[PDB]
Amino acid sequence: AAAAKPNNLSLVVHGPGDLRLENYPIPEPGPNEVLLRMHSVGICGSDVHYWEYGRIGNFIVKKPMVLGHEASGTVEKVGSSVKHLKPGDRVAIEPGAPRENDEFCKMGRYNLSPSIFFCATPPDDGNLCRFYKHNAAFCYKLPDNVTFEEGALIEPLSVGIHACRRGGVTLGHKVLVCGAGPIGMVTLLVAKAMGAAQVVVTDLSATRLSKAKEIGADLVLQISKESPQEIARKVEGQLGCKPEVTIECTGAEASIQAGIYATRSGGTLVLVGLGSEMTTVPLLHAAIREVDIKGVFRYCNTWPVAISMLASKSVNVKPLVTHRFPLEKALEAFETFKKGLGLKIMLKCDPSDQNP
Amino acid sequence: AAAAKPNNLSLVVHGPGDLRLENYPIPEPGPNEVLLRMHSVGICGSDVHYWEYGRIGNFIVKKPMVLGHEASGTVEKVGSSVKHLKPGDRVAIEPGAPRENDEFCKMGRYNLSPSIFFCATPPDDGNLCRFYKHNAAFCYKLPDNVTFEEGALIEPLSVGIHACRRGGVTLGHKVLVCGAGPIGMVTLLVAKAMGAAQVVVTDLSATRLSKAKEIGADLVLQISKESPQEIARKVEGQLGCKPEVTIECTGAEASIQAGIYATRSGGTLVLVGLGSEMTTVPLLHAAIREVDIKGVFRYCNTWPVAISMLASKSVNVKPLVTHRFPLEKALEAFETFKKGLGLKIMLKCDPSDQNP
Amino acid sequence: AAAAKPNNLSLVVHGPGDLRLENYPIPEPGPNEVLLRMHSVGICGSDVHYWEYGRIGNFIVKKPMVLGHEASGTVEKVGSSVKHLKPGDRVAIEPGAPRENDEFCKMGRYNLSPSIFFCATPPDDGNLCRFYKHNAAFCYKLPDNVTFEEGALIEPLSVGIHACRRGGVTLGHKVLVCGAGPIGMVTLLVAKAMGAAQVVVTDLSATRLSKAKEIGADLVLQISKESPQEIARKVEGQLGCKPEVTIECTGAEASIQAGIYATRSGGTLVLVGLGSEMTTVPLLHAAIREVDIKGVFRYCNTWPVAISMLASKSVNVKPLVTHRFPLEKALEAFETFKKGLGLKIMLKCDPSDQNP
Amino acid sequence: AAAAKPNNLSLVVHGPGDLRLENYPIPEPGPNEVLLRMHSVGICGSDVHYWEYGRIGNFIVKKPMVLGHEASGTVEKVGSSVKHLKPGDRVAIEPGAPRENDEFCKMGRYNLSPSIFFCATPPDDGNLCRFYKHNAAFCYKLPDNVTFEEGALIEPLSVGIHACRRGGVTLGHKVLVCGAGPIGMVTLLVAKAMGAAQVVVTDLSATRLSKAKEIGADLVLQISKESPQEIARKVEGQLGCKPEVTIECTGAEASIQAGIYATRSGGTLVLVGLGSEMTTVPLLHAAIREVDIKGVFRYCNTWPVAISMLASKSVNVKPLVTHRFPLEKALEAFETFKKGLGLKIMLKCDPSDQNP
Ligand SMILES: NC(=O)c1ccc[n+]([C@@H]2O[C@H](COP(=O)([O-])OP(=O)(O)OC[C@H]3O[C@@H](n4cnc5c(N)ncnc54)[C@H](O)[C@@H]3O)[C@@H](O)[C@H]2O)c1
Ligand SMILES: NC(=O)c1ccc[n+]([C@@H]2O[C@H](COP(=O)([O-])OP(=O)(O)OC[C@H]3O[C@@H](n4cnc5c(N)ncnc54)[C@H](O)[C@@H]3O)[C@@H](O)[C@H]2O)c1
Ligand SMILES: NC(=O)c1ccc[n+]([C@@H]2O[C@H](COP(=O)([O-])OP(=O)(O)OC[C@H]3O[C@@H](n4cnc5c(N)ncnc54)[C@H](O)[C@@H]3O)[C@@H](O)[C@H]2O)c1
Ligand SMILES: NC(=O)c1ccc[n+]([C@@H]2O[C@H](COP(=O)([O-])OP(=O)(O)OC[C@H]3O[C@@H](n4cnc5c(N)ncnc54)[C@H](O)[C@@H]3O)[C@@H](O)[C@H]2O)c1
Ligand SMILES: [Zn+2]
Ligand SMILES: [Zn+2]
Ligand SMILES: [Zn+2]
Ligand SMILES: [Zn+2]
């Protein structure tokens, strides 16, 4: 009998509350794709939400979908046209890969390309499996002094990088970050790395705020039942001034209103968190003080920069990982996520290496 | 007896529905100010609103306030430190003059200076009178080939210049302008002068849209009871694509929502129109497609540019003037404004010259 | 006997002074390429220089090269993956097509991609022939009201568009354009279309300056033997001020120095013309007044905008065409170019349609 | 007899090699000025150059000029219109203060205002004395946790802040800094604080490079007689890529050329160093790869930011101070500077407090 073939066990969502571990064919890379032996994949609210509700807004799982989109792996095989990667290369995978070179791509904002492929966003299958193929241009080699988990953390870190860029965060800025979830945390890390003089972080959880303090938050504010205006007042009282940039990472209407009231005139309020379709806010207040309201849709051109920051030890995201499980314990990992006691949970897909 | 002294008849609002023509002392210019013999002053909804309600938002007339803030005049006398202006110079007056060189002025956005002085915005007296003194740095000499009325029209034109700048309007753009009032009209003029390939103007009035066409609107849409999504659909239908920039000049919530749905991803929605304190809008929609929402608060650094555009005949604002009255007929002029049949009404304050 | 096959007569440069018309195989389009029946191709100094010297700097013809890179044509056949174009579509061809999605492409500046393919720049064959294949993403459909020659003129127009963007040309600017060659002319057209209040054009030829006047030049200055400082003085005297932007389209050292001396502090000097490897200039003068010196390497993201400006009749480049010849008279066309009496010479490659 | 009056001993240059300590009248502050009891004043090559040659370029000392322009002090008295400062306030003094609100000030680039007043640049007297009056808008209160010397170091630090801003230095960038003098050093500090992943510093002195390493330089290159291309090659060799930004802080022609060759395409070469009037450089090389060349003229809008960075301990400039002398030993301090063995020399003007 022939030698046993490799397997491609994958974590799949079939519908609400229907999560399964099942085998998939081994992908074959096209001329400009590479086949990756998946190593580390972090999970986030998006994956868990698809599992629980089978959808996220207009994004609905109409057919079984493989989850996972924050990952790194090892190049197993390369397509006939791939030149910058070779078997054995450790790489970080940027999940959003444009299908066509449209005007958004040409202008440098490929994240807005309407037909972009994106891991784990229906109908595009994610990378929480053994073997995964991806456009080679969006697989970035990791330096030897950067771990697989760091490579996987580049995905959430990139949201923070993109958010701070969109907000214009720069040297000496006083920045308000609403929310101490993993997104608010990476935003904090990026803001400090970009030279923000003071970063104030808010959240409903004292626990998450204490963690924020641990990694650099200069000031923290636990939100209980204060009004948006009161929050803005407390933030300003703590900073001794109004923050030039507010990065909203909760998606909560009250927080958005607070961001509008708190941001300095001529400043920028970046909306990262996703809330409901409609939001009632004091637009007049923001518009009249020229406080710009800029949204964020994932990211663009952040992987090389993230890798440079990690390789130079300019930022430390390792503290973000609070738990790791092998791919096979995905269900246990998802249930753990729901407990909401951690931050970032890593899934280890390569049986030959379960290390960071 | 001595020769008769000059007079400074002024148009003053004492409260809701209390408009009066009364004499004021002749201002004496300080070292860095100039005394102007007012010539042409255009009036707008702001002046009329202070007349009708004695206030606009939180800006309330607590003591009689002279109206007018869109003006030009002739330098009568100059302060001991003034050197760029001399008696006889025809000048356009920029109404907003900072009282202190704060961080906003230093960074180039003096319009956001908290303590800025602004004509006809309580408690600062306007210039609808015979003689008015103003900071010399904010009085700009008009070239011989630019009329006083064009000089007065620089104020509303500047709102359009600032709005298009904030929106990033540039060569080849498809621009949507919501509202065909004088503000939407100057915005249309500026957008076209900046190279916009197509400008679509919307409004409830067919008459205003017809006028928009006359001065350059490539396409127009009369709005009735369509929903914001339907408006967005129609605009896109006319353009065959989504406008990269939308300049909202109505303040109507429905129009703001339409702008969010209509604007191309990565584009900009500029909020010029003033509406209610709170607004319900689809921020999530704008965020996911990175449609920036930028407000406008008057303007900054637009007078020299406006003057250059007028002197080179790059724009023609004259069609905006639909009526002109001598200062003494200010009441009739405000009554005519209330008829909402015109566009821009000019008040002529210099008895020696009532010409454009 | 079988029907006669089509031909692909091409204009080829074999070495200095060795220009030949010879037949080439009919290209076969790959999955994302389209085969074009070439219609109109404009020629410029680059093509003529390759013919005369067999090279341009480090760009040397090491093997016979087909000339031509300013063109338009009709889609003859489309690759299996092409979706936005179909046979019969009239298209404008952007000559620079990236071979790989590197960081320059992702960041929105594909013109800087080191491995970019570019028509008629050794070793990449141009499109002065009957049939030519090209990446479909870089073939743009022409509206019915835009001619083939206009489509071909988009290439030089794009240099002007890119140059003005790089220079920050905007509403009300006083712009100095050095050189009245076709590049200086399209720059002039673009500057005016972007809202420049006054454009001053310089040149050694009164003839070219008169042509410049005809298409919009507000002011012209024929250069004889004045020094750079004298030129700067005359330009300022004519404008009554220093231009905020200077676009150098001659590549001449003296002109570059003049641009440095003439540009307003805080302004921008754009270098479009190609001179010698080294240039002696008053860097200190520019640097100390923060006059930025920005170069231009062809263009990026200008075709859709150019098409929008042409389709909306916002700019008129037709006056630029001073002569047209069928492909077969290429030698006569090149000799005519050398006479330097015209501006843009068009080659007509489609025997079935020799019209504009 | 009456009580002894205070003195205003000043360090004055009468001409080449003619430095004197002499008494000046005590300045009386105007309505918008403040009188400062000078505390700490750092000296730099500019002060020393005026001493040695009695001039710098076209700025010539035609009458005795008080030196010093990098200072901090204590508010002694305030003008009748000053409200943001009071007696006893510790403040940092920004030396460049505009005399008129011209278009440069209005646009946010007051450093380019032609009539700007600037300490110790003939004919404007500096602040190396006991009492000095200055525009109140340009005196910034220092937080309690920021020393007077740090306040004085804000001036050179601001050159670095402005330079990095002009260069677009940001997160993850690889930056090349040419020159390890105090200017290159502060530039290094700022680049790292702004998130640069790697900063390479070059210099002729191994000692200065060793000091650069001590404060953060990731890589250093000692320059001997290598050519500009060789320097560019070596820099790239160390980084494994080309730096996105190069900040030239030597003024040496060879270094400027190296910067052009070394900078990544689409990147920026910032010219801070002052050299000869004319410079021979490969502009064609920079243009073809769109390497922008931006000069720096002091700074604008950097004091509040510097103060925020110092108060938050985001940067440490203290290591730059290599020696401190009381005002009375100014001659010895200038002699020590000429020994070129230190970096930043501080002069202590307040006899009541000679501490940092
Ligand atoms: N736009 C994008 O591209 C993108 C990509 C990733 C995540 N997101 C979104 O960003 C948001 C943050 O995600 P995450 O993983 O950090 O989520 P999370 O749930 O882990 O963290 C959100 C935090 O907000 C806090 N919070 C809730 N309401 C608050 C309020 N009113 N005031 C202050 N704090 C409040 C919560 O206690 C929590 O710690 C989510 O809405 C997520 O969907 C956006
Ligand atoms: N932010 C600023 O600095 C600033 C300065 C000037 C004016 N403004 C504001 O800009 C707005 C425009 O003022 P204006 O003088 O042109 O006013 P206006 O009343 O003359 O014109 C407003 C126009 O909007 C139209 N309109 C109303 N609802 C509409 C809708 N749903 N769809 C389309 N069109 C609609 C009206 O028919 C009218 O023609 C006002 O709200 C004014 O207060 C702002
Ligand atoms: N960087 C790019 O991507 C790019 C692409 C196209 C062309 N170019 C370059 O732009 C330049 C202009 O090309 P073109 O087709 O218009 O060339 P051209 O030869 O037709 O025109 C150049 C003009 O400059 C004038 N001139 C020469 N020296 C002058 C001086 N000292 N003062 C004033 N005028 C002077 C000439 O009389 C002539 O009219 C060339 O150097 C060309 O190679 C650059
Ligand atoms: N533009 C402005 O606003 C402004 C303000 C401050 C200083 N500056 C200028 O910036 C420059 C830096 O001044 P500073 O105080 O640091 O001077 P400095 O003399 O202390 O330092 C200059 C350094 O350059 C090094 N150097 C010289 N030639 C070199 C070369 N070819 N390669 C590499 N290194 C080389 C020297 O060894 C020295 O360490 C000076 O030219 C100064 O005039 C400009
Ligand atoms: Zn995620
Ligand atoms: Zn008005
Ligand atoms: Zn060409
Ligand atoms: Zn100094």
Short mmCIF file of C-alpha atoms and ligand atoms in Angstrom, two decimals, chain A residues 288, chain B residues 44-45 155 159 178-185 202-205 208 223 248-252 254-255 271-275 296-299 337, ligand 2:
data_model
loop_
_atom_site.label_atom_id
_atom_site.label_comp_id
_atom_site.label_asym_id
_atom_site.label_seq_id
_atom_site.Cartn_x
_atom_site.Cartn_y
_atom_site.Cartn_z
CA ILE A 288 -18.40 72.60 13.46
CA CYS B 44 -27.18 85.65 4.04
CA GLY B 45 -29.36 83.32 6.08
CA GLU B 155 -16.94 85.51 1.75
CA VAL B 159 -16.95 78.64 2.12
CA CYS B 178 -26.30 68.57 -1.98
CA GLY B 179 -28.25 71.82 -1.98
CA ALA B 180 -28.46 74.61 -4.54
CA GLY B 181 -28.66 77.55 -2.17
CA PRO B 182 -25.88 80.15 -2.53
CA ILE B 183 -23.51 77.86 -0.61
CA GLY B 184 -24.12 74.90 -2.88
CA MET B 185 -23.77 77.26 -5.84
CA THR B 202 -29.38 68.28 -5.82
CA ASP B 203 -32.14 70.44 -4.37
CA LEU B 204 -35.85 70.56 -3.58
CA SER B 205 -36.32 73.50 -5.94
CA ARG B 208 -32.60 76.68 -8.06
CA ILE B 223 -35.32 65.86 -4.55
CA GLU B 248 -23.42 68.52 1.82
CA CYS B 249 -24.84 72.05 1.79
CA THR B 250 -28.33 71.60 3.26
CA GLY B 251 -27.81 70.33 6.79
CA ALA B 252 -30.74 67.96 6.27
CA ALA B 254 -31.69 62.72 4.92
CA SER B 255 -29.20 64.45 2.64
CA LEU B 271 -20.48 68.61 5.95
CA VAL B 272 -21.07 72.31 5.34
CA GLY B 273 -24.79 72.57 6.07
CA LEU B 274 -25.93 73.16 9.65
CA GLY B 275 -28.66 70.94 11.07
CA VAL B 296 -16.37 72.76 7.68
CA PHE B 297 -16.28 75.77 9.97
CA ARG B 298 -16.20 78.82 7.76
CA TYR B 299 -12.75 79.01 6.17
CA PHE B 337 -34.56 87.67 1.29
N1 LIG E 2 -20.24 75.49 8.22
C1 LIG E 2 -20.11 76.76 7.80
O1 LIG E 2 -19.07 77.38 8.03
C2 LIG E 2 -21.18 77.46 7.06
C3 LIG E 2 -21.08 78.86 6.48
C4 LIG E 2 -22.24 79.19 5.59
C5 LIG E 2 -23.37 78.50 5.52
N2 LIG E 2 -23.49 77.22 6.15
C6 LIG E 2 -24.71 76.41 6.08
O2 LIG E 2 -24.78 75.80 4.83
C7 LIG E 2 -26.17 75.54 4.51
C8 LIG E 2 -26.47 76.10 3.15
O3 LIG E 2 -26.84 77.45 3.33
P1 LIG E 2 -27.32 78.33 2.15
O4 LIG E 2 -27.11 79.73 2.29
O5 LIG E 2 -26.96 77.77 0.73
O6 LIG E 2 -28.87 77.95 2.39
P2 LIG E 2 -30.18 77.88 1.62
O7 LIG E 2 -31.30 77.75 2.52
O8 LIG E 2 -30.23 79.07 0.66
O9 LIG E 2 -29.97 76.60 0.67
C9 LIG E 2 -30.20 75.27 1.19
C10 LIG E 2 -30.78 74.47 0.05
O10 LIG E 2 -31.00 73.10 0.49
C11 LIG E 2 -32.10 72.62 -0.18
N3 LIG E 2 -32.50 71.38 0.50
C12 LIG E 2 -33.11 71.25 1.72
N4 LIG E 2 -33.30 69.99 2.09
C13 LIG E 2 -32.78 69.25 1.04
C14 LIG E 2 -32.66 67.86 0.85
N5 LIG E 2 -33.08 66.92 1.67
N6 LIG E 2 -32.17 67.43 -0.36
C15 LIG E 2 -31.67 68.39 -1.21
N7 LIG E 2 -31.69 69.70 -1.12
C16 LIG E 2 -32.27 70.09 0.06
C17 LIG E 2 -33.07 73.79 -0.11
O11 LIG E 2 -34.17 73.68 -1.05
C18 LIG E 2 -32.14 74.96 -0.47
O12 LIG E 2 -32.06 75.36 -1.85
C19 LIG E 2 -26.98 76.11 5.68
O13 LIG E 2 -27.32 75.08 6.60
C20 LIG E 2 -26.00 77.14 6.26
O14 LIG E 2 -26.32 77.39 7.65
C21 LIG E 2 -22.41 76.70 6.82
#
